[PDB]
Design a protein around this ligand. Sequence first.
Ligand SMILES: Nc1ncnc2c1ncn2[C@@H]1O[C@H](COP(=O)(O)OP(=O)(O)O)[C@@H](O)[C@H]1O
Ligand SMILES: Nc1ncnc2c1ncn2[C@@H]1O[C@H](COP(=O)(O)OP(=O)(O)O)[C@@H](O)[C@H]1O
Ligand SMILES: [Cl-]
Ligand SMILES: [Zn+2]
Ligand SMILES: [Zn+2]
Lengths: 69, 69
Amino acid sequence: DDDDKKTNWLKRIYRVRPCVKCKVAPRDWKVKNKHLRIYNMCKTCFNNSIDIGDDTYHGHVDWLMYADS
Amino acid sequence: DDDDKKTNWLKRIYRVRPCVKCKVAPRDWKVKNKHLRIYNMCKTCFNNSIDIGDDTYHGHVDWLMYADS
Ligand SMILES: Nc1ncnc2c1ncn2[C@@H]1O[C@H](COP(=O)(O)OP(=O)(O)O)[C@@H](O)[C@H]1O
Ligand SMILES: Nc1ncnc2c1ncn2[C@@H]1O[C@H](COP(=O)(O)OP(=O)(O)O)[C@@H](O)[C@H]1O
Ligand SMILES: [Cl-]
Ligand SMILES: [Zn+2]
Ligand SMILES: [Zn+2]
C-alpha cells in the first residue's frame, strides 16, 4: 500500500538524520494539517540557540504525510 | 538552505529504491505542480504490466519539492 511507503520513508528520514547542532538527539517536529514538519534541531538545541543568539541552524522541512496529493 | 535538504533527500529517495518490479531500472516519475510523483515502476515494467494484465504494482508516491508548505 502506497501510504505505507510514504510513512516508512518518513520514519527513516526522521531516524537517520539527527539534530543538526548536537548530531545526537533526534529533531523536534510537529504535525501541520497533512504535513509533518521536521525542525532542523532538537528542542534543547533550539532553546539554546535563542539563548546564545544564534539563528544559523533555525529552519525545517515539511513532508506530505500521504502518498497522494 | 532548507530547500536543498528537501532536494537532496529526493535525489537520494529516487536513487536507492529502484523499480518495484524489476529492482534494477530507476522509477518513472513526473512533475505535478509543486510535487514530484515517483511511480512504483520504471516505464518498461509499467507498460509490461498492462500487457500481462497485472495491476499489483501500479501506484506512486508524491513528494512536495519544497521545504516549506
Ligand atoms: N527545533 C527547531 N529547530 C530549528 N528551527 C526551529 C525549531 N523550532 C522552531 N524553529 C523555527 O522557528 C520559526 C517558527 O516555526 P513555526 O512555529 O513552525 O512557524 P509557524 O509560526 O508557521 O507555525 C521557524 O523559522 C522554524 O523553522
Ligand atoms: N510507471 C508506473 N508505475 C506504476 N504505476 C503507474 C506508472 N505510471 C502510471 N501509473 C499508475 O496509473 C495511474 C495513472 O497515473 P497518473 O497519470 O499519474 O494519474 P493522473 O491521471 O492523476 O495524472 C495511477 O494509478 C498511477 O499510479
Ligand atoms: Cl514531501
Ligand atoms: Zn540538538
Ligand atoms: Zn522495472
